[PDB]
Enzyme design. Structure first.
Site, PDB file in Angstrom:
ATOM      1  CE  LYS A 275      98.803  49.334  16.705  1.00 56.79           C
ATOM      2  NZ  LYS A 275      97.881  49.385  15.716  1.00 56.79           N
TER       3      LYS A 275
ATOM      4  NE  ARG B 149      93.648  49.883  10.499  1.00 58.04           N
ATOM      5  CZ  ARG B 149      94.971  48.727  10.324  1.00 58.04           C
ATOM      6  NH1 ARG B 149      95.066  48.701  11.424  1.00 58.04           N
ATOM      7  NH2 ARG B 149      95.431  48.140   9.591  1.00 58.04           N
TER       8      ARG B 149
HETATM    9  C1  LIG Z   1      98.711  48.060  12.140  1.00 57.91           C
HETATM   10  C2  LIG Z   1      98.409  49.531  11.307  1.00 57.91           C
HETATM   11  C3  LIG Z   1      98.695  49.216  10.091  1.00 57.91           C
HETATM   12  N1  LIG Z   1      97.657  50.569   9.966  1.00 57.91           N
HETATM   13  C4  LIG Z   1      96.687  52.092  10.787  1.00 57.91           C
HETATM   14  N2  LIG Z   1      96.490  52.859   9.539  1.00 57.91           N
HETATM   15  C5  LIG Z   1      96.503  53.925  10.492  1.00 57.91           C
HETATM   16  N3  LIG Z   1      95.832  54.842  10.847  1.00 57.91           N
HETATM   17  N4  LIG Z   1      96.186  53.945  12.192  1.00 57.91           N
HETATM   18  C6  LIG Z   1      96.647  52.558  12.643  1.00 57.91           C
HETATM   19  O1  LIG Z   1      96.679  52.649  14.547  1.00 57.91           O
HETATM   20  C7  LIG Z   1      97.331  51.320  12.263  1.00 57.91           C
HETATM   21  N5  LIG Z   1      97.953  50.339  11.711  1.00 57.91           N
END
Ligand SMILES: C=C1CN=c2nc(N)[nH]c(=O)c2=N1
Ligand SMILES: C=C1CN=c2nc(N)[nH]c(=O)c2=N1
Lengths: 266, 266
Positions: B211, B245
């Site tokens: 990010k 994740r």
């Molecule tokens: C860019 C995304 C798309 N979906 C996500 N979903 C969760 N749970 N956490 C995230 O940081 C997340 N980032």
């Protein structure tokens, strides 16, 4: 937190700004000379420059098999690196004579893996030239009653030896000596409780780079331990270490910088 | 610590053994079809298999620009991955209709980046099929009085919405939503105080992979953020998250395993 800078000579190192990176210098010796050869010293200078360019704040230079010739090997390297790389240098020895020589040659910090227990005279050398000394935890056995409490006792035995020789508090740095005198499981225990070393009130340097306990956990050979070393460096910094002694300077320097930002350092 | 396993359907995930790795699936769509094409689905299956082989414990599959066709895109991918990769699948949507379809197609977990605030009906879907749901912190603004305390309030607003629909505590997972509705400096603050989310008593999943705030700290583009992501994953796990994740499964899986060993997990 630290109300003084680490005074090294021409260089001065801030302890509050950032986690300081100690680069481990390659020592692939010349099978043909007693030491000092061009291929040996040029590879050494070359490695230092790379490490400097990758974000190293200190270069660590080690000779370790006899006293008289350890000087021969390491002295020419300090001379060339100190000349050509503008970074403080630490000599990785536990031998009094060796240490004298290396600072003579231009080294700024002593790095004793026996914490002044192998040759206490080294402490006198340290006080004498007024250089910072790293006192690593070590012992010739693994019979711990309470690992952490014994490490702190053992460490404190090094401080006594050092202060008794005239070493100032500000020139003292501690190291938990991961991978020394400890089982793999004990290495994890020290890691998990590293913040305890802080009560002694000294900057702490951690050295876990590519070591066997990382291997024992991941089941991976030395060249596959970059992610494992990274974990120990991150956890180290979160637990308050001021220095890390790594091989992969570029990588470690990046994680260290991110940790620093996250944990509010600098 | 956790007296129950995460029940996913055919698969069950232990929360005490290890930090669980969530692999982020590539969604490079076919510029030529409405969705379902061979090149699109085969690259998807291929990526899942690699991630499974690199140590992923869950595959996360996202479609995100209209409702009716989001199903078209993501449904064929769930069908093929669930068939060919023996790992639980989570659907990264915030849309009720979409979620229904995806579990229909074989997805085991819901991943809502709006924590049931965009379309509360999704919570009903979750309760209905009895699947675990991830409730991420989000909001359409950045006007925080007290970042952490507001995140916890906002999060708790998601739990209420979920429980009110019949979602069981054991099928609830929280996410601090790093990179959402937060400035770079606020992203660091949430990271630094992540352990606070624990008081709510729910497994926490962190998602910081590659990010912009990592970029803002290191000044490095998305492809150069492996060491930065690694720092946030290590600090996350130390602060008690049960899932991460990530994109770089092999690397993250290694650091996560080393953290686990060090911090006494498993
Ligand atoms: C860019 C995304 C798309 N979906 C996500 N979903 C969760 N749970 N956490 C995230 O940081 C997340 N980032
Ligand atoms: C293998 C070595 C050689 N010298 C060292 N020196 C310090 N200070 N710390 C270490 O972990 C260390 N490891």
């Amino acid at each position: 937190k630290w109300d003084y800078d680490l005074r090294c000579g021409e260089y001065t190192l801030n302890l509050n700004e950032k986690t300081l990176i100690m680069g481990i210098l390659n020592v692939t010796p010349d099978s043909f000379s007693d030491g000092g050869s061009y291929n040996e010293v040029d590879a050494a200078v070359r490695h230092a420059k790379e490490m400097r360019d990758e974000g190293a704040h200190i270069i660590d230079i080690g000779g370790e098999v006899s006293v008289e010739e350890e000087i021969k090997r390491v002295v020419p390297m300090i001379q060339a690196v100190s000349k050509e790389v503008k970074l403080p240098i630490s000599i990785d020895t536990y031998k009094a004579e060796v240490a004298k020589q290396a600072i003579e040659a231009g080294a700024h910090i002593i790095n004793d893996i026996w914490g002044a227990k192998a040759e206490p005279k080294i402490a006198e050398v340290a006080a004498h030239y007024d250089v910072p000394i790293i006192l690593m935890h070590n012992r010739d056995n693994m019979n711990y009653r309470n690992l952490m409490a014994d490490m702190i006792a053992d460490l404190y035995d090094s401080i006594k030896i050092a202060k008794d020789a005239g070493v100032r508090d500000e020139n003292i740095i501690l190291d938990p000596g991961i991978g020394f005198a400890k089982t793999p499981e004990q290495n994890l225990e020290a890691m998990r409780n590293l913040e305890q070393l802080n009560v002694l009130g000294y900057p702490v340097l951690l050295g876990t780079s590519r070591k066997s306990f990382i291997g024992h956990v991941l089941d991976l050979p030395v060249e596959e331990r970059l992610e494992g070393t990274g974990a120990t460096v991150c956890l180290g910094i979160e637990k308050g270490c001021e220095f890390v002694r790594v091989h992969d300077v570029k990588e470690m320097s990046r994680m260290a910088k991110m940790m620093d930002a996250m944990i509010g350092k600098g």
